[PDB]
Amino acid sequence: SEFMKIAIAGAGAMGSRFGVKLQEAGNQVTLIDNWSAHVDQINQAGLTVTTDDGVDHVYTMTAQHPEAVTDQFDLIILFTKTMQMDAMLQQLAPVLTNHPIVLTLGNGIGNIETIERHVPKNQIVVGTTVWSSGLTGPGHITVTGGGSISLQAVVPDQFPNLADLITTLNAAGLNASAADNVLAAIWKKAGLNSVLNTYCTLFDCNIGEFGALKNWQTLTATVLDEFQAVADAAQIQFSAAAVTDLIAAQFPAAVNGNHYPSMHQDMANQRPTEIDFLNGYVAKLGQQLHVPTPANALLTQLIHSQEQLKQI
Amino acid sequence: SEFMKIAIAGAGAMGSRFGVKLQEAGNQVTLIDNWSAHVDQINQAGLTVTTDDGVDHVYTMTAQHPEAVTDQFDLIILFTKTMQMDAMLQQLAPVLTNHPIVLTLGNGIGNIETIERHVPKNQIVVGTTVWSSGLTGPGHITVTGGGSISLQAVVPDQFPNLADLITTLNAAGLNASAADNVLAAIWKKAGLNSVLNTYCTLFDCNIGEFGALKNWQTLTATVLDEFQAVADAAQIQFSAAAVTDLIAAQFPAAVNGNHYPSMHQDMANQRPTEIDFLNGYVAKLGQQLHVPTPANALLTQLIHSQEQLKQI
Numbered sequence: 001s002e003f004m005k006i007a008i009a010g011a012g013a014m015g016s017r018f019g020v021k022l023q024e025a026g027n028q029v030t031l032i033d034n035w036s037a038h039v040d041q042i043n044q045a046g047l048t049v050t051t052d053d054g055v056d057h058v059y060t061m062t063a064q065h066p067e068a069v070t071d072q073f074d075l076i077i078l079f080t081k082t083m084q085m086d087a088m089l090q091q092l093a094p095v096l097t098n099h100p101i102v103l104t105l106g107n108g109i110g111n112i113e114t115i116e117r118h119v120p121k122n123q124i125v126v127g128t129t130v131w132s133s134g135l136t137g138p139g140h141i142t143v144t145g146g147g148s149i150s151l152q153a154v155v156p157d158q159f160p161n162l163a164d165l166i167t168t169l170n171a172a173g174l175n176a177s178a179a180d181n182v183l184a185a186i187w188k189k190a191g192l193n194s195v196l197n198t199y200c201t202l203f204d205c206n207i208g209e210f211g212a213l214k215n216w217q218t219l220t221a222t223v224l225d226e227f228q229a230v231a232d233a234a235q236i237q238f239s240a241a242a243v244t245d246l247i248a249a250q251f252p253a254a255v256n257g258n259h260y261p262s263m264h265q266d267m268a269n270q271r272p273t274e275i276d277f278l279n280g281y282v283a284k285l286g287q288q289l290h291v292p293t294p295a296n297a298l299l300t301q302l303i304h305s306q307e308q309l310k311q312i
Numbered sequence: 313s314e315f316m317k318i319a320i321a322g323a324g325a326m327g328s329r330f331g332v333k334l335q336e337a338g339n340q341v342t343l344i345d346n347w348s349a350h351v352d353q354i355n356q357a358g359l360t361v362t363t364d365d366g367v368d369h370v371y372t373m374t375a376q377h378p379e380a381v382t383d384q385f386d387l388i389i390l391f392t393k394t395m396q397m398d399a400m401l402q403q404l405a406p407v408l409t410n411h412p413i414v415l416t417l418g419n420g421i422g423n424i425e426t427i428e429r430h431v432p433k434n435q436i437v438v439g440t441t442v443w444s445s446g447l448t449g450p451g452h453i454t455v456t457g458g459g460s461i462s463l464q465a466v467v468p469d470q471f472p473n474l475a476d477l478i479t480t481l482n483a484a485g486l487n488a489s490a491a492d493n494v495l496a497a498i499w500k501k502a503g504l505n506s507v508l509n510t511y512c513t514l515f516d517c518n519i520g521e522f523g524a525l526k527n528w529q530t531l532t533a534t535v536l537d538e539f540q541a542v543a544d545a546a547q548i549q550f551s552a553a554a555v556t557d558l559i560a561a562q563f564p565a566a567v568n569g570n571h572y573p574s575m576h577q578d579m580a581n582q583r584p585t586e587i588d589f590l591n592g593y594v595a596k597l598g599q600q601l602h603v604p605t606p607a608n609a610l611l612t613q614l615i616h617s618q619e620q621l622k623q624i
Contacts, residue, residue, distance in 0.1 A: 202514070202614065205621055213617050222610060294606040298534060302514065302614075305525050309517055 002164070002171040005072070007032055007095070009088055010079025010106065011039075011063065013133035016141045018077060018105075018174070020049055020059055025172035030071065031063045032092075034084075039063040041139030050142045066091040075101045075165070078115075082108030082277040089118040101165060105129055105149070109190045109285075110277040112154055112183075122158035125165070127151045128185045131174070148175035152182035184237040191227045191243040194278040195220050196250065197263035198299050201273070201306065204264070207250050208257030220244055223279065226293045230282055233289035263303075270310050275303040314476070314483040317384070319344055319407070321400055322391025322418065323351075323375065325445035328453045330389060330417075330486070332361055332371055337484035342383065343375045344404075346396075351375040353451030362454045378403040387413045387477070390427075394420030394589040401430040413477060417441055417461070421502045421597075422589040424466055424495075434470035437477070439463045440497045443486070460487035464494035496549040503539050503555035506590040507532050508562065509575035510611050513585065513618065516576070519562050520569030532556055534607045535591065542594055545601035575615075582622055587615040 006022055008015040011031035023029045031047075033039050041047075042063035049057045066088060072095055080088045085106070089096075096102075102119055104111045105127045115124055131147030149169060153159035162178060169176035199219055200210055210216055224240035231238030250256040266273045279296040286293030318334055320327040323343035335341045343359075345351050353359075354375035361369045378400060384407055392400045397418070401408075408414075414431055416423045417439045427436055443459030461481060465471035474490060481488035511531060512522055522528055536552035543550030562568040578585045591608040598605030 199617075203617060203621055209621060209624075213620055215613055215617060219613055219617065222606075222613070292606075294534075294604075295610050298607050298610060301527055301531055301534070305511075305515060305527060305531065308525055309515055309521060312521075 002168045003027060004074040004168050006030070007069070007071075007073040007076045008079065009066070009076055009092065010081075010084075012079055013135040013141050014105070014129065014131065015077070015079040016047060016135075017049070017131065017133040017143055018079075018172075019061065020047060021174060022169075022172045023059070023061065027168070027172065029062070030069065030073070031061060032066050032069060032088075033063065034065060034088075035138070036065075037138035039065055041137075045139060048140045050136065050140070052144055069095055071095065072098045073100050075103060075168070077103045077105060078111075079106050081106055081274065082110045082114060083272070083274045085111065085114050089115070093118070099123060101125060101161075103127060103151075103165075107186070107189055107193075108274070108277050108281075109187055110281045111186075122153075122155050124154040125151055125159070125162070126154060126182050126186065128182050128189075146175075148177065150177050150179040150182050150185070152179055181237065187227070187231055187236055187238055188243055188246065190278060190282075191224055191238070191240070192246050192250075193261075193263075194227070194282065194296070195223050195243075195247055197261045197273075198223070198275065198279055198303065200261050201263045201267050202299070202302060206258055206260050206264075208253060211248070211251030211257070217244075220247060222295045223299070226286065226291075226296050227282055229291045230286045230289060230293065233291045234285065267303075267306060267310060272307065273303060275300055279303075314480045315339060316386040316480050318342070319381070319383075319385040319388045320391065321378070321388055321404065322393075322396075324391055325447040325453050326417070326441065326443065327389070327391040328359055328447075329361070329443065329445040329455055330391075331373065332359060333486060334481075334484040335371070335373065339480070339484065341374070342381065342385070343373060344378050344381060344400075345375065346377060346400075347450070348377075349450035351377055353449075357451060360452045362448065362452070364456055381407055383407070384410045385412050387415060387480070389415045389417060390423075391418050393418055393586065394422045394426060395584070395586050397423065397426050401427070405430070411435060413437060415439060415463075415477075419498065419501055419505075420586070420589050420593075421499055422593045423498075434465075434467050436466040437463055437471070437474070438466060438494050438498065440494050440501075458487075460489065462489050462491040462494050462497070464491055493549065499539070499543055499548055499550055500555055500558065502590060502594075503536055503550070503552070504558050504562075505573075505575075506539070506594065506608070507535050507555075507559055509573045509585075510535070510587065510591055510615060512573050513575045513579050514611070514614060518570055518572050518576075520565060523560070523563030523569070529556075532559060535611070538598065538603075538605045538608050539594055541603045542598045542601060542605065545603045546597065579615075579618060579622060584619065585615060587612055591615075 006029045008019045008031045011033040019029045019031045042061050046058045047061045103125045134142040136142050166176045228240045263273045280300040283293040283297040318341045320331045320343045323345040331341045331343045354373050358370045359373045415437045446454040448454050478488040540552045575585045592612040595605040595609040
């Protein structure tokens with residue numbers, strides 16, 4: 001009875017990892033991705049999962065490109081980064097006629113709003129996860145330690161079978177728990193990213209160097225006070241002070257002192273950044289809620305400008 | 313009777329040029345500067361002024377380092393960039409006991425406020441100029457065409473002898489006119505500089521490249537709407553639209569399309585920038601006048617951060 005038919009939209013490190021534990025627990029899983037070498041590697045030689053011990057576990061899996069799915073699922077777990085999401089849901093439009101559960105486990109505050117345009121919002125379940133996974137290559141991921149999951153329906157009153165959903169996951173050893181605090185934690189992670197990704201990209205510095213700035217506190221506060229004012233308007237729990245501590249914890253060289261965050265790399269390699277889904281998204285919501293967000297609106301403009309200059 | 317005893321605090325291209333025409337018209341002029349090679353060059357071999365024709369006019373002049381002046385003047389003409397001004401007025405503190413006319417012809421909206429702390433504000437006369445001058449080297453400047461001057465006492469009611477002042481200058485062929493619109497024009501120039509210097513430095517681009525940005529209008533508007541709101545509060549004439557046109561006029565390669573403005577160069581050569589006296593100054597005034605300036609406050613922070621990263 002804990003059987004569900006399950007799709008993984010975003011068969012990356014995490015999606016691939018979740019796909020396997022859910023399959024090995026008897027569920028019928030399809031992995032969906034656009035990366036040709038990945039999808040093809042799995043259909044021809046199985047997904048490989050290098051465990052604690054450097055031991056290669058070849059697992060037989062079903063993979064497909066999004067446009068090439070006509071099957072329907074009881075549950076779709078989205079791992080699509082917010083930016084690719086609209087495209088990924090566009091391309092899956094047919095499969096959602098049955099109105100399945102949409103379980104977004106990606107990062108990004110823009111996800112619910114983005115998802116609302118493709119399905120009924122009563123089907124949406126946001127989640128966070130500390131399960132980890134590395135993507136070593138096509139049809140190849142590396143795993144260590146354990147983890148858990150925390151879930152929260154967007155509209156708790158209209159949502160059926162959160163218990164069954166949790167049972168299904170926990171049956172695959174995933175440690176799912178119902179919680180009322182998931183959207184808060186998504187906002188927390190996006191507060192951190194909207195400071196460290198954005199400023200590091202703007203300054204062409206790494207996280208330690210940002211940390212060493214005489215004015216990092218004011219730069220941080222400026223972004224976060226606006227998040228706070230918007231979180232409050234949207235009635236989501238948020239503490240600027242807490243996020244600031246999380247931000248500070250990254251500075252040491254033992255942690256991320258010498259790391260250039262994902263946005264900096266995107267800029268360096270002339271990839272569009274997720275800025276519209278970080279500071280860009282807080283500004284947009286701000287305006288919907290009549291909360292002024294001039295600093296996040298501006299930083300968003302500065303990054304787009306940077307993009308345009310790199311492409312030359 | 314149009315004779316005055318005159319000091320030039322800021323004996324650069326313009327100060328040196330004004331020093332000469334005022335001397336040749338019978339006034340007793342002292343040139344004041346910190347650049348050793350300059351001051352020494354003039355005391356030993358005269359100031360050279362290469363005219364339209366590539367003809368070298370050697371002129372005998374008096375030059376001194378600021379700390380080494382005990383003379384007193386009827387008029388002091390400041391050409392000191394706002395940033396050096398406080399130091400330059402600190403070092404001249406003794407000479408102002410007589411309460412002379414202070415004629416600031418430098419650029420910068422921060423000048424009056426800065427000057428007010430050193431002399432009575434009834435002695436202050438702000439000015440603009442289209443006289444041009446190149447600084448070729450120590451005791452060496454190059455001149456072409458002509459020009460004029462426009463003056464405006466800070467407090468028009470308490471100021472004596474604006475007519476005599478103008479007579480003194482015009483006696484040296486300088487074309488001084490009384491005007492009520494000088495502080496406005498200083499603000500105009502500072503609106504342009506606070507967009508083009510600041511953003512070019514932040515983007516490591518030249519003026520044409522800024523001009524080619526999809527969002528240059530919004531970036532510009534963001535800075536200028538705040539200037540506008542502050543100019544209004546301070547009851548100074550200002551048009552964001554007009555400054556925008558002046559800004560647009562720079563983009564073409566025939567004009568400044570391939571120029572990196574002074575702030576970009578300062579950053580490149582690890583010189584402190586004038587940011588606190590551009591966007592920094594509009595923000596500070598904004599707060600005095602209860603006009604919100606979050607964008608200019610922020611850009612000011614971003615540039616300081618940039619400075620600190622370059623010095624490493």
